[PDB]
Design a protein around this ligand. Sequence first.
Ligand SMILES: [Ca+2]
Ligand SMILES: [Cl-]
Ligand code: NA
Ligand SMILES: [Zn+2]
Length: 200
Amino acid sequence: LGPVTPEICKQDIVFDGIAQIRGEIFFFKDRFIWRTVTPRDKPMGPLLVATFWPELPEKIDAVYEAPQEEKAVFFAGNEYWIYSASTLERGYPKPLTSLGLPPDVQRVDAAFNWSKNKKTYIFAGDKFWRYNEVKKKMDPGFPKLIADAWNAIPDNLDAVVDLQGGGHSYFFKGAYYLKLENQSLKSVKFGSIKSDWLGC
Ligand SMILES: [Ca+2]
Ligand SMILES: [Cl-]
Ligand code: NA
Ligand SMILES: [Zn+2]
């Protein structure tokens, strides 16, 4: 007798964060992860996030992999953790203020590094920030409003990821994802997370 764990396809799971880390896609839900190497193939899981990142709290809010450093950055509450493989770095968790976020944002929604410009975007409610990974600082003139800067992208995102050299960013909210053409921000298509990411 084991405890009940979430069942993809049989339940409507809205993930906390999604990230491609070291060529693998991770879907995070509470203490668990499912992973796959290519999107429409049914992911292995649930594994426990603790067998890879033991220091992470029981729920993350957003995850991305900083491309250059190939470090995984996880947000949970008003802290973030940066790892190289399963090794937590020097002095993490740090408050979100060490990333350049204002002390008023107490949690973020979704985060990704966008291959279109290799800048990191951090989404929180109706706003986002663009973080410079080489200068290790936020770019000026942020936060901007998602409604003002993105095309057909909803506020309160769940997760965002840009896979590989695929040239699409994927915004996940509720049961659907929006697929953005990185070369044509005008062209946004929608699809179903269960059918297209979880291979249900
Ligand atoms: Ca989230
Ligand atoms: Cl995310
Ligand atoms: Na992400
Ligand atoms: Zn079942």
